[PDB]
Structure 1
């Protein structure tokens, strides 16, 4: 029953996703708000602890006690230059506990501090409860994914987050490996298969090159930008609309924190619409000083606003090919991962770079990793019996 069941979890930097392989198909499980992905956010309030959508929805009102980006800290030492650099951009406090970072917050009126693995375990607990609500019984066996460049310390702290959350961790697998499994790229028979995974998420960009030789996976190269993602494109839209509001009304809104946040969430929504329509409309009642902001933007203007950012995704692709010592024609498969790969201009740029090649994109890109993890979790639990 439950002992023969296993889930696949994509524990992402900004969003997490959970899947289950049953009756010959993967089911990506919707949360209690009907969303197939859940924000990797944990909020600490005066009465409760919030995880996911409810935590992301109150981030504006409670920025000091709303934790996110725990995956940027997991398995790292406080002194690490990555930690020191990132800390300058977070509104929550990061403290040092014997060269280990802890996030310090106010919870139910008391000062509390948590290890990144304790924060990630609260995200994992929510994903576990989402699966349990869908299945009707508690499931404890899980496959959890990590980026291909995670070292032993980051993988061990991710497994520890799984243990704290009450999960039996069957395996820690690489995110590009889970994506290649989702597309059945390890079941093409004999001979080495070279796969490039193009993963553009909410806050990170990763390029991975894998060789699959008779079911065996090998990471040939990893490249990317840890600080490039969908949120930079939302910010380019924000800057445009701040300048358009100034041209129409002769008023600078940039300093009004509420106006900028409402504009940011509307821009994110308009950006998503621009992936399937050639225009999107913004409808913000009383944006600033009682002034409604009802406007629109074409996909052409959006592509101009992010042009330099979209083009920058091709340098890590070339860098990964040179590190792997492979030419473009030596890559058998191109796989899209991350919600931002839905942007038509991004697909066009990657397709033209690979001389007009077809892209593997039929699986929801923000769901492909959980999909593959769910497939692996089913194979692993079946072999365990």
Structure 2
């Protein structure tokens, strides 16, 4: 029953996703708000702890006690220059406990501090409960994914997050490996198969090159930008619309925190529409000083607004190829991961770089990692019997 069942969890920087492989198919499990992905957010309020959508939904109202980006801290020492640099950009406090970072917040009127694995365990507990509500029984066996570049300390702290969350961690597998498994790229028989995974998420960009030799995965190269993602594109739309409001009304809205956040969420939404329509409409009632902001933008203008950022995704692709010592024509498969890979200009830039090549994109790119993890979790639990 429950003991013969296992889930796959993509514990993402900005979003997490849970899948289950049963009756010959993967089911990506929708949360209680009907969302197939859940924000990797934990909010501490005057009455409760919120996880996911409810936590992300109140971020503007409670920024000091709304934790996100715990994955950027997990398995790292406080003195790590990555931690010291990132800390300057978070509204929540990060403290030092014997060279280990802890996120410090106010919860039920009291000061509490949590290890990154404790924050990540609350996100994992949510994914576990989402799977349990779907299945109708508790599932505790899980495969959890991590970036291919995670070292041993980061892998161990992710496993620890799983244990705190009440999960039996069958295996910690690499995100690009789970994505290649999702497409069955490890079951093409014999011979070395070179796979490039192009993963453009909400806050990070990862390029991975893998060689699959008779089911055995080998990481040949990892490249990318840990601070490039979908939210930078939301921000480029924000600056455009702030400048358009100034042209129409001779008013600068950039200092009105509420106006900027309402514009930001509307921009994120319009950006998604621009992936399947050639225009998107913004409909903001009383954006600033009672002024409605009913406007639109073409996909052509959005592409211009992010042109440099879209083009910058090709440098880590080239870098990964040189590190792996492979030319473009030596790559057998191209895989899209991360919601931002739905952007047509991004697909076009990658396909053109690979000389008109087809892309593996039939699986929801924000779901491919959990999909593969769910497949692996099923194989692993079956071998355990």
How far is 1:245 from its partner? Answer: 0.0
Q: Give 1:339-358 correspondences, 5 Å limit.
A: 339-358=339-358
Q: Report Cα offsets for 1:50-92 as digits up to 9, x if no partner.
A: 0000000000000000000000000000000000000000000
Q: Report Cα offsets for 1:9-44 as digits up to 9, x if no partner.
A: 000000000000000000000000000000000000
Tell me the distance in 2 between the aligned counterparts of 1:285 and 1:136.
42
How far is 1:267 from its partner? Answer: 0.1
Alignment size in residue pairs: 385
Q: Report Cα offsets for 1:258-285 as digits up to 9, x if no partner.
A: 0000000000000000000000000000
Where does the alignment leave 5 or more consecutive residues of structure 1 unmatched?
none
| Counterpart in the other structure of 1:318 | 318
Tell me the distance in 2 between the aligned counterparts of 1:86 and 1:190.
44
How far is 1:290 from its partner? Answer: 0.2
Where does the alignment leave 5 or more consecutive residues of structure 2 unmatched?
none
How far is 1:4 from its partner? Answer: 0.1
How far is 1:296 from its partner? Answer: 0.1
Q: Report Cα offsets for 1:178-235 as digits up to 9, x if no partner.
A: 0000000000000000000000000000000000000000000000000000000000
Tell me the distance in 2 between the aligned counterparts of 1:256 and 1:137.
47
Tell me the distance in 1 between the aligned counterparts of 2:62 and 2:13.
20
Tell me the distance in 1 between the aligned counterparts of 2:18 and 2:33.
14
How far is 1:333 from its partner? Answer: 0.1
Runs (4+) of structure 1 exceeding 4 A deviation are none
Tell me the distance in 2 between the aligned counterparts of 1:289 and 1:336.
42
TM-score, normalized by length of structure 2? 1.00
Q: Report Cα offsets for 1:133-166 as digits up to 9, x if no partner.
A: 0000000000000000000000000000000000
1:181 aligned counterpart, secondary structure? helix
2:296 aligned counterpart, secondary structure? strand
Tell me the distance in 2 between the aligned counterparts of 1:237 and 1:101.
34
How far is 1:314 from its partner? Answer: 0.2
Q: Report Cα offsets for 1:332-381 as digits up to 9, x if no partner.
A: 00000000000000000000000000000000000000000000000000
TM-score, normalized by length of structure 1? 1.00
2:269 aligned counterpart, secondary structure? helix
